[PDB]
Every structure is written in structure tokens, then in C-alpha cells.
Design an enzyme around this catalytic site. Structure first.
Site, mmCIF file in Angstrom:
data_model
loop_
_atom_site.group_PDB
_atom_site.id
_atom_site.type_symbol
_atom_site.label_atom_id
_atom_site.label_comp_id
_atom_site.label_asym_id
_atom_site.label_seq_id
_atom_site.Cartn_x
_atom_site.Cartn_y
_atom_site.Cartn_z
ATOM 1 N N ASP A 62 -0.170 -8.898 2.418
ATOM 2 C CA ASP A 62 0.378 -7.543 2.551
ATOM 3 C C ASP A 62 1.865 -7.502 2.856
ATOM 4 O O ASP A 62 2.329 -8.194 3.788
ATOM 5 C CB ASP A 62 -0.383 -6.794 3.641
ATOM 6 C CG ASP A 62 -1.824 -6.418 3.216
ATOM 7 O OD1 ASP A 62 -2.312 -6.831 2.134
ATOM 8 O OD2 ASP A 62 -2.484 -5.672 3.963
ATOM 9 N N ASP B 123 0.854 -1.200 0.000
ATOM 10 C CA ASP B 123 0.000 0.000 0.000
ATOM 11 C C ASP B 123 0.884 1.242 0.000
ATOM 12 O O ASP B 123 1.713 1.364 0.908
ATOM 13 C CB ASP B 123 -0.852 0.000 1.262
ATOM 14 C CG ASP B 123 -1.963 -1.008 1.166
ATOM 15 O OD1 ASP B 123 -2.674 -0.887 0.150
ATOM 16 O OD2 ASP B 123 -2.125 -1.887 2.039
HETATM 17 O O1 W72 Z 1 -3.970 -9.879 4.790
HETATM 18 C C1 W72 Z 1 -5.055 -10.042 5.374
HETATM 19 O O2 W72 Z 1 -5.154 -10.387 6.737
HETATM 20 C C2 W72 Z 1 -6.250 -9.675 4.473
HETATM 21 O O3 W72 Z 1 -7.473 -10.198 4.998
HETATM 22 C C3 W72 Z 1 -6.326 -8.154 4.297
HETATM 23 O O4 W72 Z 1 -7.027 -7.681 5.446
HETATM 24 C C4 W72 Z 1 -5.134 -7.182 4.209
HETATM 25 O O5 W72 Z 1 -4.558 -6.915 5.488
HETATM 26 C C5 W72 Z 1 -5.526 -5.864 3.533
HETATM 27 O O6 W72 Z 1 -6.402 -6.175 2.450
HETATM 28 C C6 W72 Z 1 -6.155 -4.772 4.394
HETATM 29 N N1 W72 Z 1 -6.457 -3.718 3.354
HETATM 30 C C7 W72 Z 1 -5.162 -2.953 3.215
HETATM 31 C C8 W72 Z 1 -5.510 -1.499 2.970
HETATM 32 O O7 W72 Z 1 -4.936 -1.057 1.750
HETATM 33 C C9 W72 Z 1 -6.988 -1.311 3.279
HETATM 34 O O8 W72 Z 1 -7.490 -0.061 3.683
HETATM 35 C C10 W72 Z 1 -7.220 -2.628 4.006
HETATM 36 C C11 W72 Z 1 -8.694 -2.859 4.301
HETATM 37 O O9 W72 Z 1 -8.928 -3.978 5.137
HETATM 38 ZN ZN ZN Z 2 -4.402 -2.105 -0.049
#
Ligand code: W72
Ligand code: ZN
Ligand code: NAG
EC number: 3.2.1.114
Length: 1014
Positions: free
Chosen positions: A311, A62
Site C-alpha cells: 500500500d 486507494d
Molecule cells: O499491506 C498489507 O499489510 C496487506 O496485508 C493489506 O492488508 C493492505 O494493507 C490492504 O490490502 C488493506 N486493504 C486496503 C483497502 O483498500 C481495504 O479496505 C483493505 C482491506 O484489508
Molecule cells: Zn485497496
């Protein structure tokens, strides 16, 4: 040209129609919580028909969220990319895909020469593949299509220049819901495939059951299918490893090798991954292949996509090893065991799509067609993500202001070549990149941590200063006799004057023009019109005296109006929010007429008494117990009165009636016509006591909104010949209705203050028989039909309002255009409502780790258009699109791309000229030159200028409004030697144009051209 109004497309899946029939029941489907127990026939695969599995390693980076872009780069991403280069270089069969070019560019330029060569060869050999190639993976709800194109172009131009590649496969795994604006831009930019992830769990279930997760996605108005882009929608709840190997996360988690302990990470399903060895590889493969074959059942070919990532993954060298070595063991065993009939290997995204299309061409499958969007997203139960359509509204509004400044700076400076010393390219590059960075799905969406929002705002503030410097240097050059022009590239010849940003009440940043009979008697001001047609618009400036008159540069008088400068203050003494008038500056207003993509100079001259062509507004303050309001030299005394209904009319336009609390009540279009009930009202939504709380992402209201208690507000009425207004100080909002003789403009100075766990909504109540239908736009590009569904909770009926929304019945339409993206809906027949701000004290469990308590005053702007539409030629009842009328389209343009204003900074402008662009063609009203950008630096023998031309589609309602010049962008600059139609990013030549003439585009189509000049 296709007819985008009268031919309803025939598609296999039309999302509005699917929404009408679907049940949306949230039942426990077993290990696949939101699906069902998938089953497969083990004999489906055999020696002649194997399952080809592509495991695609990836890392979601991100560009700012929990940390700033730079902090993530230093602590994470630079290590991910450094170790990726090393690992891929050393392990030739390993693969990796990369999406965020902002990070990759940041990285690449810190690389030594030898590493850059190494990086280029792993890209050339196919191991490291860029997906999408945009500066970021943009938000798809709040973003304007112009900025989606801008950031895609910034990243792909960088990739072509430095990596010599242009991605044709798009990867969007994190935006919170998806827009058809993406396939539209991508398909016109050379793309052949795209992938999406965050769609409603019910949709995923529904499409999976029909094996419709892969489809040819066309625009809702596209009858032929020429806009279609093959799209793959992932089937599960997340893009992480536990939700990408197959249906059962407890099993898939055991195949994320970063979760055994030394990385902190673990499996919440209680079974950890175990190193693969000769003792367990058969048992592990049994589990894994079973998952793959189940996931394979949801798709049509024998080619399976298995993303492997999460991530900021692939950071530690040991992580590369633990994922790579364990999967290699699995592959060796699986591929050598005939009984699985599987051939698995690491692959890239494009490898996956190429294999799918080979299978398709082999007649192994045919794909369905689909039109529609994927908003509003819910990842589980009733958690609809409609809160980010409004979160951090200050920056959402800032996005639109910068969108326009960028366009104006690139366009004004494109007319000439500039010496490197002027640093034009450098300043535009910075402006484009800071704005492109903000399109990230944690930027404009308002879902970043407080200090990260601060970082984005500071970056956009520098981008705004960069655009102003380029614009003012350009104006000085375009309007000064050539033989007199003597530039100092660090000097301020002009300063910009902006009436709506940050806005009066948000920041006192406008400069007053100081004039005086004993000092400077006059001052030059210049207006720029970025749109390709002649435009007239009232412009206002602050002046030190009310006795000022306006002339054009042939000295012809121009009619003007002077009004006081009114500001509002929460009088924490008589506990009122009341207005104060300036006794030291005044506002002058006049109509500026500006050439297409051109400039017009005017002069303001002071006198010692009322000038002949300047009039003065009357002012009325309505409140009980009034006190006087002195206005310095303003010549007319303010009048007072008790609250009462009032009515106003500027010119021949509508007559508006207001309640005694200063809010619109009704609109009468003409003298004769009736008083149509149109009432503004402000309400508030709260947050739930127990249960899931609203946050930056989620909107979880504790019921319908309740009225804001107004009390007896102070109403200020200004009546002038050119502009009138009614303003009222409400709790949290100074609301103003401004009339210039056409559709009124509404401005809200919103300061939620310390109203914790509150969302302030602005609603319009009419008696238009709209039923459950309404319309909202997607990225300022198209309007889509919405149907309010009572089977869905309130928050699910909220949709993105990036630039406009409307409701209509057989005879009447009310359209509300916005100057900033916000969330909104029609919760009942004849209503339109749009959220203004939201202050949330709790986290909504999506990883942000904080609520939204950093609110700040913001000036929201709108245009409100009430129209008769029984005579308009509208689409049939079955068509999923809607279109604006000419007046509403021009009203949206007046908000997004107003005339720019420049004040000459020094006492005397030697060599000043009165106009630029009088010879530019004034193109038909539905056509816009969205972008004009010089693509070559001055040392280039052959100069190149790129243009993005967009034609919208306006309803036919019986107003000829004709006679216009054909706009040929290729002949706008002199000495044209070639004209080419290109992809929208300008990176690939698509057609050599005869006679070097660029044809005009069809309704709803967008084209790009690059003209070459000797
Ligand atoms: O990697 C995990 O645990 C997945 O379930 C995702 O939660 C991952 O952290 C990620 O997509 C979280 N995304 C990252 C960010 O760019 C968002 O605002 C947010 C919303 O939840
Ligand atoms: Zn993201
Ligand atoms: C860029 O890619 C093309 C293929 O389109 C190739 O022919 C050319 O040699 C490449 N240029 C460089 C700098 O490697």
C-alpha cells in the site's frame, strides 16, 4: 446466437461444482499456512530451460479509505508519482505499474510542461505501464456492471487522450472477492489478460494443487468460449512482498527492503531484510531463488510473476533506491550463476503475460477453462467478508440513484450539440467522475472511515445536482418550439421531483405544486423515459389541494387518484411509531405514458370541488385506542379499527393478505388460484461476545437471527383505485407494501438508531420446495445459481444481492428485486433474506481501525414477484445460470430506471410541446440502450454519438408478447455518415457497418456503436 439456456457449458473447473466437492478444511500447512510444503525437482531447470522471473514493482493507492482521496493525494500519492517519474527517468531498466487513473489524472494536471513530456516518454518506452486503466480498481460485489463500465471508460478515455495508450492487461489485487462480470466487460473492451488476488484460501489451495491458477475464464452460460479471458489468480494470502516472492513469508519479508528500520516498518516473522553485498549475495540469492522455484511449481510455464509492492509504496526517494539497488545486486549475481538456471529482471504486467503466451504457443503448456465466481471471500479461518455487501447501505442506495441520473443526463443532453457556455460537458464529466470514484472497493463497499464516507456522499450530492442541471436544461430545449427557445444556462426551468430518494421519512425535499383558483390554476409536469420502449408507469406529485385533475397535452383527461401525504413519527409520548397525515399538501397519482427514450408533458389543474376524473383513496388506521387524524381539505374521513387481518386487491392483479401486524402473509395470483403463504418477517443478528467481531468487512453472527419484538404496531391502510398500500411502524423500520396492480413494491425506511452490535434482516418465509438452491445476481448483469452448504458457516452462505435474488421449485418462483445492493441468502428451503443495515461497535482487524457507528435513515425499495414457472423453459439441473421472467425483469427496471419527473418552475412555459421521441423505435423488451453519450464537442465538424446496447435473456413461459421494431441506434440522430461497432469504451473501431445500420445483439451479449454525423 448461442443458446444460453439449454446447452450446459463443458469447462475444466466450474466453481459451483468445485464448491460441492471441496472440503474447506482449515489445516496448518506449515510456513505456507494455508497450503503445504512445496517441493521441486532442481533438475527441472537447466541451460536450455531456465526460469524467467519478472519482478513487477507496484504501489496500491486507494482513492479514499483511511484518508480522503485528496488527503492521500497530498500526503502520499503525489510524492509516489513525482518520485516515480524521476526514478524511472533516471534508471532505464527499472519498471513500475499504475492502476488508479483518478489519482494519475489528478497528478498529471498539476504537472509542468516539461514533466508531462518526460512522463509521456517513460510511458511510451514501457517503463511506466498502466494496468486496467480504470478511474479506480472497482469493488466487484456491489457495483453495477453499468458503473464498472462507466469508471473503466472514464480512465481509459483519459489515458488514450493524454498518454496515448489503452491497457489490455487488468490488475485487481484488493477487491474482496471477484466477479466474472469483469472478464465479460474487459474482454469486450479489448483486454487479453487479467489478474486477481482475493479469493478463498481454500480455493487457492485447491487450484494450486492442480496448477489451475491460470485459466481461460468464460461466462457461466458460454458454451462456445467466445467470452473467455486469460486470468491469473495469485496463490498466497496477500499481495504484499512477504506473500508474493514465494511460500514462506519469514523468508520473503527479508526481501522487502523498506523494512530495515528507518521507514518504521518491520518483519513480523522476526528476521529483518539486510542490505545485499558481495559477502551475503550468494546466501541471499540461495534463499530467494528457492522461494521463486517453489512458487513456480504452482504454475504451468517457465515464466514467473513476482509482484514487488504494497500500500502506497514507492513514496520516498530513498525507498526507490533501497528496493532498486538491492534487487539489481540480486539480479546480477543470480543471472551470472549458471547453476540457478534463472534469468530475473524488473518487468511490467504485460511483459509477464506476453512471455507466458509465447511459452504456451511454443507448446510448453495448455490452460484449463473455468466458469463461476469467487464469492464469498474468506482470507482465514471463518472470517468471511460478507458484511460489506451491506455496510453503509444509505450510500449503496445512493449509488443506484446516481447511476440512473448519470445515464439520464448523458442521454437527454446527447440529442443536441451544446455551446461551451452551457457547460454541459463540464457538468457531466464531474458527475461521471464522482460516481466513478465511488465504485472504488472502499467506496460503495462501505469500508472507509466515517469522514471519508462523508467525502464520497458530498461528492455524489454535487454529481446529482450536476445531472439535474443538465437534465432540466435539456428537457427545456427538447420541448420548446425552436423559434421561441431562449436559454439562460444558469436558470432552473424545471426542478426534478423524486419520490424515492432521499425518500419520504429520510428528508422532506420534494416541492409541493402550489395551485389556486385565485393564483396559478395549472402547472406543467414532464416525464422522461430513458428506456428504449414505450412505457406506462404511475407517477405522483405533491399538490396544495386535493381537487386537482390531470390532462395530457391534447387536453385529454387522464384518470388520477389523490391520497393524503402520510409521514411517520416515533411518538416519544405514547411511545408508538405512528403516522400523521398532512393537512397542507396531498399526493396526486396518475399513469404517464412516455415514448421510447423520450418525454411526455402533462398538466395538473386545480378546481374548487371533486374533478370528474380524479378519485380519492380511503384510509384505515389499525391500532387499539385510536385518536382522530385530521387531513385538512382531504374529502374522505380516516376510518379506525382494532388490529386485524386484511386483504387488498388493485385492478385485476394479485390479492394480498396481511397479518394483523401489517406484514404480508399470503398472495393469491388470481380469483380462483390459492393463497400462497409468503410472509415477511424482521429479525436481528448480533455480534460474538468473545472471539472475532463483525465489522465493516466481516459478518460474524453470534448464531441465527432472532425475531424483532414488534409489540402491537400501528398499521395504516390506504385503498385507492390506482394504488393501495399497507404500512406499519416496526422498531427500526417503517415497512410498506404498495400495490399498483402488478407485483407489489416494498419500501423500508430503516433507522437502526442506537442499536449497537445489531444487523437487521428482512426475511421472506414461503413453502416453496427450494431445498438448498437459490439464485443471486452478479452486478445487475446475470443470475448465478447458489447452493447453500452446511459444511460452511452461516456468513459464508451470504452472497452479494446487487439487484435481485430468487428461489423456485418445480412450479413456483418468488423473486425479490432491489433498488440497492445488500447482502442476502436462503438459509433454509423456501426462505429468502436480505440484510437492511448493520451497526457494529468494534473494528474487524482489516485495517479500517473503527466499527460502523455512522448509520443514518435510508429508504430501501424492492419489487416482490410471485410466479408460476412450471410452464417456463428453464435450464437443466446442471446449468450454473438462472434467468428472470419478463415480469421480474420489468420489475427490476422500474426500480433502477424509473421515469424521471420534472416540474416547470415558473408560472408559464411559453412554447411548451407535448411530447418528444414519438418516432423513436420501441425495441424488444429484453434489449436496453444502457448508454447513450455524445462523444464530440460542438466545434467538431463530424459529430459522434456512442451507444452501449445490452440484451438480457428472459425465460420463455408461453406469453407471445411480440411485434416490435428493430432498433438501429445509428439512425437515431439525423445525417448519419458512418456507423461503427467499437469496444465498450468507444476507444477502438472494430467493424465498419454496412448501410450504417447497427445490428441488434444476442441474448446476454453487450455491444457498442458509434454513429458519425455531418
Ligand atoms: O499491506 C498489507 O499489510 C496487506 O496485508 C493489506 O492488508 C493492505 O494493507 C490492504 O490490502 C488493506 N486493504 C486496503 C483497502 O483498500 C481495504 O479496505 C483493505 C482491506 O484489508
Ligand atoms: Zn485497496
Ligand atoms: C499514439 O500511438 C500510435 C500507435 O498506435 C502511434 O503511431 C502514434 O504516433 C501515437 N501518437 C502520439 C501522439 O504519439
Amino acid at each position: 446466437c448461442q443458446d444460453v439456456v439449454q446447452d450446459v457449458p463443458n469447462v475444466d473447473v466450474q466453481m459451483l461444482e468445485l464448491y460441492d466437492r471441496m472440503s474447506f478444511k482449515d489445516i496448518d500447512g506449515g510456513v505456507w499456512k494455508q497450503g503445504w510444503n512445496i517441493k521441486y525437482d532442481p533438475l527441472k531447470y537447466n541451460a536450455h530451460h531456465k526460469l524467467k522471473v519478472f519482478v513487477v514493482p507496484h504501489s496500491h493507492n486507494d482513492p479514499g479509505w483511511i484518508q480522503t482521496f485528496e488527503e492521500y493525494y497530498q500526503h502520499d500519492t503525489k510524492h509516489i508519482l513525482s518520485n516515480a517519474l524521476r526514478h524511472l527517468h533516471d534508471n532505464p531498466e527499472m519498471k513500475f505499474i499504475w492502476a488508479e487513473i483518478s489519482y494519475f489524472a489528478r497528478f498529471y494536471h498539476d504537472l509542468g510542461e516539461n514533466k508531462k513530456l518526460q512522463m509521456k516518454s517513460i510511458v511510451k518506452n514501457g517503463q511506466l505501464e498502466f494496468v486496467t486503466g480504470g478511474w479506480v480498481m472497482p469493488d466487484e460485489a456491489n457495483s453495477h456492471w453499468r458503473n464498472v463500465l462507466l469508471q473503466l471508460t472514464e480512465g481509459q478515455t483519459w489515458l488514450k487522450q493524454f498518454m496515448n495508450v489503452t491497457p489490455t492487461a487488468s490488475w485487481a489485487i484488493d477487491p474482496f472477492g471477484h466477479s466474472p462480470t469483469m472478464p465479460y466487460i474487459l474482454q469486450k473492451s479489448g483486454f487479453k489478460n487479467m489478474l486477481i488476488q482475493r479469493t478463498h484460501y481454500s480455493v487457492k489451495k485447491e487450484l494450486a494443487q492442480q496448477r489451475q491458477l491460470e485459466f481461460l475464464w468464460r461466462q457461466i452460460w458460454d458454451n462456445k468460449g467466445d467470452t473467455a479471458l486469460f486470468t491469473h489468480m495469485m496463490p498466497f494470502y496477500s499481495y504484499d512482498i512477504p506473500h508474493t516472492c514465494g511460500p514462506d513469508p519469514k523468508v520473503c519479508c527479508q526481501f522487502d527492503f523498506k523494512r530495515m528500520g528507518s521507514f518504521g516498518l518491520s518483519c513480523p516473522w522476526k528476521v529483518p531484510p539486510r542490505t545485499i553485498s558481495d559477502q551475503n549475495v550468494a546466501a541471499r540469492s540461495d534463499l530467494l531463488v528457492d522461494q521463486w522455484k517453489k512458487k513456480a511449481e504452482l504454475y504451468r510455464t517457465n515464466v514467473l510473476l513476482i509482484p514487488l509492492g504494497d500500500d502506497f509504496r514507492f513514496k520516498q526517494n530513498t525507498e526507490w533506491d533501497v528496493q532498486r539497488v538491492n534487487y539489481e545486486r540480486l539480479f546480477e549475481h543470480i543471472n551470472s550463476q549458471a547453476h540457478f538456471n534463472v534469468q530475473a529482471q524488473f518487468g511490467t504486467l504485460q511483459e509477464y503475460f506476453d512471455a507466458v503466451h509465447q511459452a504456451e504457443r511454443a507448446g510448453q503448456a495448455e490452460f484449463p477453462t473455468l466458469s463461476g465466481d469467487f464469492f464469498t471471500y474468506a482470507d482465514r479461518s471463518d472470517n468471511y467478508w460478507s458484511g460489506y455487501y451491506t455496510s453503509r447501505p444509505y450510500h449503496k442506495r445512493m449509488d443506484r440513484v446516481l447511476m440512473h441520473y448519470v445515464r439520464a443526463a448523458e442521454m437527454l443532453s446527447a440529442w443536441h450539440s451544446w455551446d461551451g457556455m452551457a457547460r454541459i460537458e463540464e457538468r457531466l464529466e464531474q458527475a461521471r467522475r464522482e460516481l466513478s470514484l465511488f465504485q472504488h472497493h472502499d467506496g460503495i463497499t462501505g469500508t472507509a472511515k466515517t469522514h471519508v464516507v462523508v467525502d464520497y456522499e458530498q461528492r455524489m450530492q454535487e454529481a446529482l445536482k450536476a445531472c439535474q442541471m443538465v437534465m432540466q436544461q435539456s428537457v427545456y430545449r427538447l420541448l420548446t418550439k425552436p423559434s421561441i427557445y431562449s436559454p439562460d444556462f444558469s436558470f432552473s426551468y424545471f426542478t426534478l421531483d423524486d419520490s424515492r430518494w432521499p425518500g419520504s421519512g429520510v428528508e422532506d425535499s420534494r416541492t409541493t405544486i402550489i395551485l389556486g383558483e385565485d393564483i396559478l390554476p395549472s402547472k406543467h409536469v414532464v416525464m422522461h423515459n430513458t428506456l428504449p420502449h414505450w412505457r406506462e408507469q404511475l407517477v405522483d406529485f405533491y399538490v396544495s389541494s386535493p381537487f386537482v385533475s390531470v390532462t395530457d397535452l391534447a387536453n385529454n383527461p387522464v384518470e388520477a387518484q389523490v391520497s393524503p401525504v402520510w409521514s411517520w413519527h416515533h411518538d416519544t409520548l405514547t411511545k408508538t411509531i405512528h403516522p400523521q397525515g398532512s393537512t397542507t399538501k396531498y399526493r396526486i397519482i396518475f399513469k404517464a405514458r412516455v415514448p421510447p427514450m423520450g418525454l411526455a408533458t402533462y398538466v395538473l389543474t386545480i378546481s374548487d370541488s371533486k374533478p370528474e376524473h380524479t378519485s380519492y383513496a380511503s384510509n384505515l388506521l389499525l391500532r387499539k385506542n385510536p385518536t382522530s387524524l385530521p387531513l385538512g381539505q382531504y374529502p374522505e374521513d380516516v376510518k379506525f379499527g382494532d388490529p386485524r387481518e386484511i386483504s387488498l386487491r388493485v385492478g385485476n392483479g394479485p390479492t394480498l393478505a396481511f397479518s394483523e401486524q401489517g406484514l404480508l402473509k399470503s398472495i393469491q395470483l388470481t380469483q380462483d388460484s390459492p393463497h400462497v403463504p409468503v410472509h415477511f418477517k424482521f429479525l436481528k443478528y448480533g455480534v460474538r461476545s468473545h472471539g472475532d467481531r463483525s465489522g465493516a468487512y466481516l459478518f460474524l453472527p453470534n448464531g441465527p437471527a432472532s425475531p424483532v419484538e414488534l409489540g402491537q404496531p400501528v398499521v395504516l391502510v390506504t385503498k385507492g383505485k390506482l394504488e393501495s398500500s399497507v404500512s406499519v411502524g416496526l422498531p427500526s423500520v417503517v415497512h410498506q407494501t404498495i400495490m399498483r396492480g402488478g407485483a407489489p413494491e416494498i419500501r423500508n425506511l430503516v433507522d437502526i438508531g442506537s442499536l449497537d452490535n445489531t444487523e437487521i434482516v428482512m426475511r421472506l418465509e414461503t413453502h416453496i420446495d427450494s431445498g438448498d438452491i437459490f439464485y443471486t445476481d452478479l452486478n445487475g448483469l446475470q443470475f448465478i445459481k447458489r447452493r447453500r452448504l452446511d459444511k460452511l458457516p452461516l456468513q459464508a452462505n451470504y452472497y452479494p444481492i446487487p439487484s435481485g435474488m430468487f428461489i423456485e421449485d418445480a412450479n413456483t418462483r418468488l423473486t425479490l428485486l432491489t433498488g440497492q445492493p445488500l447482502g442476502g441468502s436462503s438459509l433454509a428451503s423456501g426462505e429468502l433474506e436480505i440484510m437492511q443495515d448493520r451497526r457494529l461497535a468494534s473494528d474487524d482487524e482489516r485495517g479500517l481501525g473503527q466499527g460502523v457507528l455512522d448509520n443514518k435513515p435510508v429508504l430501501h425499495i424492492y419489487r416482490l414477484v410471485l410466479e408460476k414457472v412450471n410452464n417456463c423453459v428453464r435450464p437443466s439441473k446442471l446449468h450454473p445460470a438462472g434467468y428472470l421472467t419478463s415480469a421480474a425483469h420489468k420489475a427490476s427496471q422500474s426500480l433502477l430506471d424509473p421515469l424521471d419527473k420534472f416540474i416547470f418552475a415558473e408560472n408559464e412555459w411559453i412554447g411548451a410541446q407535448g411530447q418528444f421521441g414519438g418516432d423513436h423505435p420501441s425495441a424488444r423488451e429484453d434489449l436496453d440502450v444502457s448508454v447513450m453519450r455524445r462523444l464530440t464537442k460542438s466545434s467538431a465538424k463530424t459529430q459522434r454519438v456512442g451507444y452501449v446496447l445490452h440484451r438480457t435473456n428472459l425465460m420463455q413461459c408461453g406469453t407471445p408478447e411480440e411485434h416490435t421494431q428493430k432498433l438501429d441506434v445509428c439512425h437515431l440522430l439525423p445525417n448519419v455518415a458512418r456507423c461503427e461497432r467499437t469496444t465498450l469504451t468507444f476507444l477502438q473501431n472494430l467493424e465498419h457497418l454496412d448501410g450504417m445500420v447497427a445490428p441488434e445483439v444476442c441474448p446476454m451479449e453487450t455491444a457498442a456503436y458509434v454513429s458519425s454525423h455531418s
